[PDB]
Design a protein around this ligand. Sequence first.
Ligand SMILES: [Mg+2]
Ligand SMILES: [Mg+2]
Ligand SMILES: [Mg+2]
Lengths: 276, 276
Amino acid sequence: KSIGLLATSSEAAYFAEIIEAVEKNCFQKGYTLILGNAWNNLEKQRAYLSMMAQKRVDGLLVMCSEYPEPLLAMLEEYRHIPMVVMDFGEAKADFTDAVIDNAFEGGYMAGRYLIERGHREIGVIPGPAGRLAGFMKAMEEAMIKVPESWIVQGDFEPESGYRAMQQILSQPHRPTAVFCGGDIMAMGALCAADEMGLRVPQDVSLIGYDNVRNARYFTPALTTIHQPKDSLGETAFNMLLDRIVNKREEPQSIEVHPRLIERRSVADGPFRDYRR
Amino acid sequence: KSIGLLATSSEAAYFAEIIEAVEKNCFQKGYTLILGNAWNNLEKQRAYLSMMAQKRVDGLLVMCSEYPEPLLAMLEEYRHIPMVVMDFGEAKADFTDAVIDNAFEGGYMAGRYLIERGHREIGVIPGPAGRLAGFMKAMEEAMIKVPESWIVQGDFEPESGYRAMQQILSQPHRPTAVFCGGDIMAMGALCAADEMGLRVPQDVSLIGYDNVRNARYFTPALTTIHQPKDSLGETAFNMLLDRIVNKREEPQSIEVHPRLIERRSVADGPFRDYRR
Ligand SMILES: [Mg+2]
Ligand SMILES: [Mg+2]
Ligand SMILES: [Mg+2]
């Protein structure tokens, strides 16, 4: 029949691939999709909420960065209509289905991979997460110092990755490897390096995060961490139906794990002078 | 307000970029979108239409691959709801709005450019067009002939672009330039060349088609033909808003012209000698 979808940003970096999968599933199961897209404003979501209760939608699905009292209270009134509140992060014992992405585990692997490969002078282009924390613990264990000037934030978009890579690489002393907190951002990092005349991985190694579909088709093929994006969505979908048909009122836990995908963007570092 | 969009295939290559422009404009105004992908089945599209009227949508946006007499017939029974029905085919004396992308002229520009640049040994990776037919004409006019061994189709995805590029490039005799009928496929071609040891455009020149968001961040920066999808979407959506307040109900004609965007993926061919 019909299902609503109250997001924060369909055309967003992190959430992007998830909604798509949701879309393809409805269509597959010949459903009607009522897309809502607020932007962190109690009114708008309030509207998208009531308007959805109006169309007598057969199931609600929420995806929000935050979940404040106002929001959660609102998500309470409309508790007559089935729903799924994807809570990315803090397992708050409220009633929202929290997803465990093991971001920290991912940041750690990237960090460890570079170390094992022989790099000690590393750079980071973070987003605006647990990833950073994990990458930082591996550097801690290895006693690697990370110059502040070697850390530049991006916005998940290519151009931000472009400018961050430029600034890091344009210093008297630069790193031999760089960890990028998002594949799309790495595309921009890859472009800036080449435009500066640097070779990858020859002159600079690089590892991203997410493992988007086109990642294997970058130049060169990008070594990155695979975060199951179009799997977490097919799950929430299935969870929704069950929640309505089998009438499964009880909540669930959507947990996943990262995995390193080795390709051609990383080379041996100067410090392979210890262990084979 | 609520807006309905009935389309054959949302995830379809051509429409995908238009649909996104619409979604974007919707959310910008705080409106809701009800998505229904019919898929050419008179029964489904017909069921979709009925439900949208039930849901009392304020406007209806239609864009299908074809309009059989039966479809137009049902569309007429719901003429009480404001709508925009985009027809990409030949303009007909009916109530539909006509859309002209001028793809033929875009293909022509591509070919002429390659020729202008000094290339005579040219290859092509066509999609599954008017642009392909506009290209060939440019080829005809300069008496150039492209061997069959240098023509390999793709399907718009990166893998087909990759696979086709290596095939063309692995021939005992290869062309100096290649026309890729899609920036996405182009991304795969670019990767293919790299892994085979060749440089673009030192060894091979490459031109795409679309000018997708990320084109400028490909490695190297992609020279391509800008095909305005965003413009179409915007125009269509505004037309619908005009009709909601009963303005310009008569059939309209939406036309766009492609433009050449010179970047860094094309170099001088062995036959240049125009000037400087
Ligand atoms: Mg989308
Ligand atoms: Mg080990
Ligand atoms: Mg004309």
